[PDB]
Design a protein around this ligand. Structure first.
Ligand code: F
Ligand code: F
Ligand code: F
Ligand code: F
Ligand code: FE
Ligand code: FE
Ligand code: FE
Ligand code: FE
Lengths: 201, 201, 201, 201
């Protein structure tokens, strides 16, 4: 298949007590799997369309592709953006740390902006720290669903799933507590790597 | 400022009779300029939000940023994707040509899919040929407005503005004639360059 | 204020085992309450914008109003659309029953279409049975979030909340089991009343 | 057919010099016709889906229905909301006038808010004055495309098409001039009628 479901880089309960293993299991094994299958199906459907020269469902197929592929991309990044507390730095350092200070003033300012973007979403969405190739800078973006409200070429560095399935079983409606807890499991080493590789464009 | 309006790589009327110089002038000097101003303003507002520690308008600012920055990105690629008839080969060759055949079956199949995506948009949008870093392939996407219906990390290779301002003065409601004429001025050399730089990340 | 949170027409656990009392409590007391506060706030902000003659945040305010007011409208209808198993006929009758057969072929056909619309949503949304004043017919619509993918003037007759908070604590990712169970508590008398009042405009 | 294209209540050039007959012709004969055909096609497709118990394209069909039906509704109202200058009052009076003063403070405040909503749209959209059945009031809404950013049950009273096809041939990019000119042709008698009939819910 074109797209495949990546395995978690840690045990399902490795992020506890901040993120329950119950959510990690459903989220990865069920939700993420769905996006991979959906993205693959969209490509097969588009291939069939070209073969038969029948593009009647093009609008449907392009949304299916964008939605599912965006879901696959967002979650693939999401898993690696996390690590058991203590297994990674609690604050970004070196080049990443300097870059965050440069584009946000400080780590705290970045955190405040990122958190505000995360909790203010009207509907399903993501809070995302991305590398902007055109502006040569780090910005925060608020994705709607998986595939909306973002410029093409944006390279994700750090993402937070704000869909209700990501926190409801544990935090219920209190999205603020979920975000507060999530900061504890951010793998700043992974974000640093993405930054090093992202800034070549 | 962070973002600047790029000059056209050719005269305003260099794409005639395919795209009128009148549209080129309004499109570049008026429309594209607005996205640059809007993107810069959004960043300035976000900076102010951080200093005052008030993120009440975060939802508005994130959409202003995404909409305007995406407009800026899309049009910047758009201008470079075109060139006077005769300045470049009318068909992709070498690495790009082989990649199109691999991911679409043939050049014609790609054109058919891209055209269908372009003319079927319900509202404003773009037809886009992008490099998918995850699947390591070339896909067609159908953007809504400037910033919707696309996965993060998508690398734009070839884009076609389907907003009404891009063709109405010349083609009126006949979107098909606009797309058909547009193929005549596609700068495959620019697309080939974007493809080469995209494969390396 | 302009908008107020309507009380549930039954006890929080009156819909069990179909919909847990825990969900009913969070859904009504927390989620619905938030839309009421948000809708009132949006109007207050719009009033302030008029007094100060500054409409810089108009885009934000119009979306805040639409999102929150739509949330308020959707949930208000939602609560009334349900009732304890046994409080109303399990199948539409009289005028409503005849109308369903006319516009859908049969009750089963309607259920199938409504269910498909409910379970296929890509993101948050609603499955909705509405009265179309223009075509003078009953149609099914699939709302995105609370305020998207619907024609102005649509009269809601029967709505099903497909946002994850509406079913996750009980049904997890299995949306189909939620929809299936939901049919058991549909208050056809309320729907019949909305239909009668809708036909007269 | 279920939906039919209404004829204009005046000659195509009756709104000049404010709105050219060229736009009126294309807009009504081409654009509006498309929405009617599209809305009818969506219903036929949904009927076929129920017959064969095949709801695979439900997401596509529901968007096609919402988009096209919303376009049909919006334009049907739009045509009647206008009249040759001098054929209708230049300002709302009686019950409508009183209602506007009540919910906006004054006619001028309403105009300012409505105009701001019209010119600030990011993408295609509508500025709309609607009757809110739940709040028992008149509000302004900013529709995105034809079917987004509005609560169910909203009854349109006055609408302004802000899609580029509505003004580009005459006003180019200067949407402000289009809105300013449009106020001259508003048929306040039609809006008054809609208000009288709208407020019964
Ligand atoms: F997910
Ligand atoms: F543009
Ligand atoms: F809700
Ligand atoms: F139109
Ligand atoms: Fe998720
Ligand atoms: Fe453009
Ligand atoms: Fe809900
Ligand atoms: Fe229009």
């Amino acid at each position: 298949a074109v797209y495949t479901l990546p395995e978690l880089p840690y045990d399902y309960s490795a992020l506890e007590p901040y993120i329950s293993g119950e959510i990690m299991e459903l989220h990865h094994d069920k939700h993420h799997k769905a996006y991979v299958d959906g993205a693959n199906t969209a490509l097969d459907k588009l291939a069939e369309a070209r073969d038969k020269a029948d593009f009647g469902a093009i609008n449907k197929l392009e949304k299916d592709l964008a939605f599912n592929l965006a879901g696959h991309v967002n979650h693939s990044v999401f898993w690696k953006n996390m690590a058991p507390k203590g297994s990674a730095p609690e604050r970004p350092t070196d080049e990443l740390g300097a870059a965050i200070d440069e584009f946000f003033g400080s780590f705290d300012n970045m955190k405040a902006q990122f958190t505000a973007a995360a909790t203010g979403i009207q509907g399903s969405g993501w809070a995302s720290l991305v590398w902007d190739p055109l502006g040569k800078r780090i910005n925060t973006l608020q994705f709607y669903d998986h595939q909306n409200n973002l410029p093409a070429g944006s390279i994700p560095l750090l993402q937070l799933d704000m869909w209700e399935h990501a926190f409801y079983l544990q935090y219920k409606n209190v999205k603020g507590d979920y975000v507060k807890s999530w900061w504890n499991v951010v793998n700043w080493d992974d974000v640093a790597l993405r930054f090093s590789e992202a800034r070549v464009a």
